[PDB]
């Protein structure tokens, strides 16, 4: 009886065993386009990805994850509201059953089809699992998809869920280039916050883009395709794999832009 997104274990019932889930700095939050303050004294964010070096594809019954190799400073994040250098870890989405849903922060109460998040670890802590331990531990870059036009850069993922359509299940998915999947723009909403599943941990410096992406219908109904349990158990549509809003208590989010 682990946890999940269905009725019997989603998110409403995450707190009994992770009691965090009821904590001061929980994710995802409404962004409040109106009170968030423009903050001068933020830096533009230093996104450095040309080195990047992508590993594996994995269905992990939540998500799935693109994996890189995090054991040198190749594909790092810096600057905005960062100290020091994070290193890029994984990506993965949180999407929908439907276009109205699936993104895990919402703007103005607007839902985004879906949420990707490329995390990464702060390098002072040498590696992931100490990372989380830290309130300064991870930096996670969130980007809203909406539905519209195909997005190039997002295919060659879209390409290769076939082969992961299950729990466990995983694929060699080298050279692929994280760059593709960013908007025109490094505007961004920051504030601190948490893991937004399980265990919830409270490490996180979010850095959420203002623009979105666009995808096409045909690439968000193949992550809808995906599967949250494993081969030869009954089927279960990964869909609605989003955390809803939690509540921004005593917290400040601040824009990038005037
Ligand atoms: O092994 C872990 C590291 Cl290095 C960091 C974190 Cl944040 C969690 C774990 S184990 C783990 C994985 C998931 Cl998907 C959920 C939970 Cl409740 C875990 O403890
Ligand atoms: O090369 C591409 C073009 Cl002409 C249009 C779009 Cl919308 C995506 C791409 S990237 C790409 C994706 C996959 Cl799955 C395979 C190959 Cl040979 C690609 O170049
Ligand atoms: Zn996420």
Redesign the pocket.
Same mark, same amino acid.
């Given at each position: 009886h682990h946890?999940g997104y269905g009725k019997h274990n989603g998110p409403e019932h995450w707190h009994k065993d $992770?009691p965090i889930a009821k904590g001061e700095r929980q994710s995802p939050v409404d962004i409040d386009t109106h009170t968030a303050k423009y903050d001068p004294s933020l830096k533009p964010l230093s996104v450095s990805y040309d080195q990047a070096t992508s590993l594996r594809i994995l269905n992990?019954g939540?998500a799935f994850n693109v994996e890189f190799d995090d054991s040198q400073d190749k594909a790092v994040l810096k600057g905005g509201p960062l100290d020091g250098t994070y290193r890029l870890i994984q990506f993965h989405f949180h999407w929908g059953s439907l276009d109205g849903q699936g993104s895990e922060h919402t703007v103005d109460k607007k839902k985004y089809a879906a949420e990707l998040h490329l995390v990464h670890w702060n390098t002072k802590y040498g590696d $992931?699992?100490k990372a989380?331990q830290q309130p300064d531990g991870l930096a996670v870059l969130g980007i809203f998809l909406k539905v519209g036009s195909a997005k190039p850069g997002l295919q060659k993922v879209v390409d290769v869920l076939d082969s992961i359509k299950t729990k466990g299940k995983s694929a060699d998915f080298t050279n692929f280039d994280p760059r593709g999947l960013l908007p025109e723009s490094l505007d961004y909403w920051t504030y601190p916050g948490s =893991?937004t599943? %399980? %265990?919830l =941990?409270e490490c996180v410096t979010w850095i959420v883009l203002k623009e979105p992406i666009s995808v096409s219908s045909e690439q968000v109904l193949k992550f809808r395709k995906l599967n949250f349990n494993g081969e030869g158990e009954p089927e279960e549509l990964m869909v609605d794999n989003w955390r809803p809003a939690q509540p921004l208590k005593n917290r400040q989010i601040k824009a990038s832009f005037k």
């Open positions: 946890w $992770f992990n939540h $992931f699992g989380v =893991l599943t %399980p %265990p =941990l």
